[PDB]
Subunit: 264 residues, 4 copies
């Protein structure tokens, strides 16, 4: 089967949580505090009852934790709860900001890779697209081959080759980017064929990072391919157009399109 899924996640099981709050969906986060919020008040409401030091307990609890202080219920450790309410809000605000600043890239990866000549040399290719109007600055991309290898002797392990790209870094990335690994004699897949790639159970990982100007935050994206997601002889279709207006356009509708010469 597959070590990597398309989204670049691994299926390796591991035998051996602020992050969970950070990761969980927006709806669930509110719920999770809302709960913590009610509960903490139940704590104090029962802490008062245990007595009657308050004129005229759950609702009084929140009135003093939120610092509403209506007044109809004058106290007496309210002071304690006022501390807790303020740290609660401070803690709350931190998580909010961390969640807001979690990296997030709208980078589209091509559904396939191709191997075809480029500048007269066979080249492994794939392409990326920036899905947002704002540019990504100082972008960098890696293409990694992961593949089963063994010594002349029986030992079996998975190799990790970081492949050489004609352009791994780019100061700016705004539209589309075809990433290219020329398969010369230094290439790990030099001389390789469709059949020999399957045998090595070999796979490809794409990793992307850059900085948005779109937000004061960094971004990451990754994607993975199996060897049967490579189109030999294929070529990515141009996604750039000239409109009737005479103006240049990017058509992402053609982004996954690949041309192939069909033999008889």
């Amino acid at each position: 089967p597959r070590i990597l899924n398309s989204d670049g996640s691994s299926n390796i099981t591991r035998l051996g949580h602020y992050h969970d709050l950070l990761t969980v969906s927006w709806p669930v986060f509110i719920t999770l505090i809302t709960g913590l919020y009610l509960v903490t008040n139940a704590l104090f409401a029962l802490a008062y009852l245990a007595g009657d030091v308050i004129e005229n307990a759950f609702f009084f609890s929140v009135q003093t934790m939120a610092t509403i202080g209506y007044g109809k219920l004058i106290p007496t450790l309210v002071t304690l709860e006022a501390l807790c309410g303020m740290l609660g809000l401070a803690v709350a605000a931190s998580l909010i900001y961390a969640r807001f600043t979690r990296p997030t890239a709208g980078v589209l990866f091509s559904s396939r890779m191709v191997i075809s000549d480029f500048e007269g040399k066979p080249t492994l290719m794939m392409r990326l697209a920036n899905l947002r109007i704002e540019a990504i600055i100082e972008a960098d991309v890696h293409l990694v081959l992961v593949r089963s290898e063994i010594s002349q002797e029986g030992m079996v392990f998975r190799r990790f080759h970081d492949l050489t790209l004609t352009r791994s870094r780019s100061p700016i990335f705004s539209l589309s980017w075809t990433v290219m690994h020329p398969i010369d004699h230094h290439s790990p897949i030099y001389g390789e064929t469709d059949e020999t790639l399957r045998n090595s159970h070999s796979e490809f990982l794409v990793l992307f990072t850059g900085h948005h100007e779109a937000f004061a935050q960094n971004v990451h994206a990754r994607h993975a391919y199996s060897c049967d997601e490579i189109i030999w002889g294929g070529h990515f279709v141009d996604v750039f157009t000239t409109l009737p207006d005479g103006r240049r356009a990017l058509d992402l509708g053609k982004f996954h399109e690949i041309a192939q010469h069909h033999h008889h």
Copy 2:
């Protein structure tokens, strides 16, 4: 026409929003929450009326959302609204900080580029100026040529050459910086002339990034030039002066000035 505008933006149309709040002007941001703020209270004010569980509805709403708690209007889900008011403030504070920390560079770019000899070799040049008193640390600059190219065969595409600079990085950038691409035989515009640059519809993109010490934040700036914004034979005028005091000064009034030898 032009793919790039002076400010380094593209005119490519794309066929295929926390950022909007982050981007929008300061005046509009306040308005946008102020609205959200009033509205959310209208929600609760109508949520109470639907009944009369409050002694002595919009104004009571805010009194419990802001946690003012005057008291003349004692309750009963106020508790719910107290949660919302606190997250509202937390959300509010996040956006504020993100906006405050959005990258912003006061970098001035020269209105033109020049090509003239430098150390006995023709050199593409342009210059940058730091507009603030605080230095930018670990600055880096790129000069990119974008240009139409085609195969011997008919296919037409735009090239992107990241040009070699005598100095792409600088640990500090405080005043003025003339960026230089020597046009040797490795240069994409080697042997090139005024006429041949127009034909390729070729353009130049400048990209700048660095870290301020001025704020704990990074900065970006970019600018673009057409081939008719290059002055062949031109030289940037020295912007450094010695004052009457005998003290050294930077005169940004001369920043866009270029000297030219005029032929008969």
Copy 3:
């Protein structure tokens, strides 16, 4: 004795504190403010008494600092204290966030290093493990030798060699990573033996940094080894397994295991 401890700390004494608040345990932090919090109110409570400008002093103090404003105690510099309460919360919230964002890596280091052949060359090795489910992006690792050296003449000093690794950087680090320094003729420990390493009192420092996608934060980890924590001839045991399901697993239970050929 040892300059470095396993955890990569030094024992060098130095003859010559927001950070303390930032560093201190979670329990102690709350205590430290709680104190500051009570005390600041004692200040104002005594500032009122010094007179009786309040209808119907410590408890009134907090009611106006937390902005509870019950009302049974109407005032008059309350205004002053309302400023202080708000900055207190602002200061509080900053420390909280800084603490939350302090770098933290769950990177496991192997208890030993080994020197054994790899691709037919003797190689210094050690391994790292990512202890969390989330990957570390753009990871980098250094292996440094620290060692006593002297001139032909008597002067004695400690050298710091940053060793060459077959792979110092990795775009992603998710599971396990064996770091390798081939001991060729350019190596500081080329020709070196067990005995000659002890004489130089030589030590090894591992330094790790990378960015989590797990949180919008960076991470650091380091570890140190003495020369008697190197196993000559040793080999790290494969920590990867195939489960009954036929699925691939990582067994960290084998992470510190090293195989050795035992001579007669």
Copy 4:
């Protein structure tokens, strides 16, 4: 005179402010808001008077801006002021955090540089010291020569040479670091002497950056030297000691000490 001061600041005058709040001393910052804080309330207090829509104006103003809500003064745009108070606090909290996170390095620079042989080659040297107990990670240092130069023809300009160091980067920096520029034939000051350095009015800039583990923040430091602050033949004294305990110590008391052979 001098272009650079010891602290690495320039004396170049420039002919052509959130940062000010960010920069200003701690005492002045509080004052600056305290003012803004009082004033904004004067605005509303006069906005009420202009009438009498409040039962039983400056003090009522703060009671509704701080959300104290005592109650003895029930309202009516209080709602407006409750918005302002909350953004005020949000703005306040942002500045606080930005100030807290402003880069700050406790890096000590040696009062002088030296030129003396090292590994049998004349070497420009200076040293740095980490003044805090926490290490700086991924540190980098530059040595720049700035110097007047002119063409064979009369034109006069200041050069900026980024000098080659035996070690410009270090994964960790914890104690002391002697930075070294070997003066080989590629060096801008190769063949140079004391007298020829003065004539070029030449100067040296040190720039330091790294990341603390001490706080989740980066650091910068810089320093400058004139040519008469170079000691020819000088050697930095070892700052490392062995204590009576037999334990290794760092004595910063010797940090600026330089040994010199005195000729007859």
